[PDB]
């Protein structure tokens, strides 16, 4: 027997239902979303870090001529300077003091400490949500990780379940993201090859060890001025450091719906949003015929002091008379009231107490014990505590969130106007008919 339902995607909150077959005892079904993982598919665009501006030792040919060649280094920059006449330690490193040409050369590479402090630029795609579920039916409980797509089934050894799709698609990751030491940022990094100096990704490479490093740091060499041999250059700041200073808060502290952003692989865990349609093929062996379950001859419900809070605020007591000792399943048939227990031992005669959480001002809902129903009616007070450290396990409706006293007042006030218009119309019709009679 297959049962189809729509659980809410809120981790840690059991969702309870009572599957009722035609000729078998009703069976409890509690489903908890223990964990979830909204994971996208990512492809590395490049890695970046602080560049090390390596300056090759200058060379001099001081009555020949040198020409700047072309290399394949990252942001390779070469220049040729004329009369320099450089000094090293003896006050003269050259002959033919005029026509004294020097080759200035510079490029950039990855800094030695970049194997730890580096950022990776990724592009993400459609996110796939996968949920770990604990499902208990009757007496048997099963753990299963299932993909929320609507087709792929999760299986536990006799139990098949298919979940999804999510009611409302959502992904906290923008198209382009950056990962740095486990911190995720939704930054719009430049595309590979489109380096710009002074900004993130000014130096790019497919990997830390990649030899095809490409960079654009706006390095410009200057003509040497001091007599002594040195090579002067000026260059833009490390864009990686500038982004680091202006990185902003990461996605671990900005992702909506309160899910923890985790890396390796990139994912968002325990994210409460939308509803999961789930169909479970409950095995035939789980059910037991109603001829074996203990029917209760009668049951009367009396609600104790109740309260519509996030936790199990209220309590009630069912005074029952039955015919046998067993394991009756109990359920609440209202969408704005959830019981704490699911199966309770039942004796021939007695009373049993059940706790429940409600989101309505009035506990005016039906409770089913071994199938047969009882209308629990009461009034629930507003909560005393203003803040609680537990999520609301029941959603708030509109027609059930309005108290019966206020509903009576509103109905009376609207019915006054309705009766006034009806009386006026009836009086007009009667007057017209009397005129027609006496015309």
């Amino acid at each position: 027997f297959e049962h189809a339902t729509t659980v809410p995607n809120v981790p840690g909150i059991p969702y309870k239902a009572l599957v009722e077959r035609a000729g078998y005892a009703p069976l409890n079904l509690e489903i908890t979303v223990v964990s979830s993982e909204l994971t996208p598919s990512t492809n590395k665009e490049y890695v970046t870090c602080r560049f090390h501006t390596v300056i090759p030792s200058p060379q001099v040919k001081c009555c020949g001529s040198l020409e700047c060649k072309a290399s394949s280094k990252a942001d390779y920059t070469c220049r040729v300077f004329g009369g320099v006449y450089p000094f090293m330690w003896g006050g003269a490193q050259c002959f033919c003091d005029s026509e004294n040409t020097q080759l200035s050369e510079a490029y950039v590479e990855f800094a030695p400490d970049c194997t730890i402090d580096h950022a990776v630029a990724l592009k993400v795609h459609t996110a796939a949500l996968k949920v770990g579920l604990r499902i208990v039916y009757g007496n048997t409980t099963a753990h299963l990780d299932t993909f929320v797509n609507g087709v792929t089934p999760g299986s536990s050894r006799d139990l098949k379940v298919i979940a999804g799709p999510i009611s409302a698609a959502f992904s906290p990751f923008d198209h382009k993201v950056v990962i740095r030491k486990g911190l995720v940022y939704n930054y719009d990094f430049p595309e590979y090859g489109a380096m710009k100096p002074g900004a993130f990704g000014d130096i790019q490479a497919s990997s830390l060890d990649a030899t095809d490093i490409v960079a654009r740091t706006d390095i410009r060499l200057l003509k040497p001025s001091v007599k002594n041999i040195h090579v002067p250059y000026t260059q833009a700041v490390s864009g990686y450091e500038m982004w680091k200073n202006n990185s902003g808060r990461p996605l671990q502290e900005t992702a909506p719906f309160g899910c923890k952003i985790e890396v390796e692989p990139l994912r968002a865990s325990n994210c409460a949003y939308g509803h999961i349609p789930i169909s479970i093929d409950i095995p035939d062996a789980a059910f037991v015929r109603s001829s074996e379950s203990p029917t209760i001859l009668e049951v009367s419900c009396t609600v104790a002091d109740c309260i519509y809070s996030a936790d199990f605020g209220g309590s009630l007591t069912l005074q029952y008379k039955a015919d046998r000792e067993g394991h009756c399943p109990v359920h609440s048939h209202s969408t704005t009231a959830v019981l704490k227990e699911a199966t309770t031992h039942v004796t021939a005669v007695g009373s049993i107490t059940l706790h429940f959480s409600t989101s309505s001002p009035q506990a005016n809902f039906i409770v089913s014990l071994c199938g047969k129903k009882t209308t629990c009616n009461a009034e629930c007070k507003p909560p005393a505590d203003h803040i609680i450290g537990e999520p609301h396990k029941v959603d708030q409706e509109f027609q059930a969130a309005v108290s019966k006293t206020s509903w009576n007042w509103l109905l009376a006030l609207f019915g006054g106007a309705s009766s006034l218009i009806v009386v006026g119309l009836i009086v007009l019709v009667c007057s017209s008919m009397l005129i027609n009679t006496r015309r």
């Binding site: 502290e253 309160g258 519509y308 809070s309 996030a310 989101s359 001002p361 009034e379 007070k381 507003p382 909560p383 005393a384 505590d385 203003h386 803040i387 609680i388 450290g389 537990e390 999520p391 609301h392 708030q396 309005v402 108290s403 019966k404 006293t405 206020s406 007042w409 509103l410 006030l413 609207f414 006054g416 106007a417 309705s418 006034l420 218009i421 009386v423 006026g424 119309l425 009086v427 007009l428 007057s431 017209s432 009397l434 005129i435």
Partner: protein
């Protein structure tokens, strides 16, 4: 110092220093009574949802106003219908139930 943070039904999560995150959810503990006198009910449902309560109160007031206006118009039209033939004729020996009813 002290910092105030509004917490809705969806909840809030705050991390102070190196401590683990702490999550808190707001109840519906509005000051008032849904099962009391009308003013208490209005206060309770105004603090929880001001826009919805204002809309409901305005709708109720409009319904009362239009109902009263319709009743008055129908009563006055009934007076016209049942009185104008007798005002155009002499010696209006009128059973006074109609005039007494719709004069006020």
């Amino acid at each position: 110092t002290s910092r105030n943070f509004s917490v809705g039904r969806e909840g809030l999560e705050y991390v102070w220093g190196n401590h683990e995150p702490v999550r808190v959810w707001a109840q519906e503990s509005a000051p008032g009574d849904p099962h009391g006198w009308p003013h208490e009910i209005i206060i309770h449902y105004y603090h929880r949802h001001p826009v919805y309560t204002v809309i409901v109160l305005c709708g109720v007031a409009l319904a009362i106003l239009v109902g009263t206006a319709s009743s008055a118009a129908c009563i006055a039209k009934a007076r016209r219908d049942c009185l104008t033939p007798y005002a155009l004729a002499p010696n209006a020996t009128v059973p006074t139930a109609l005039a007494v009813l719709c004069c006020i």
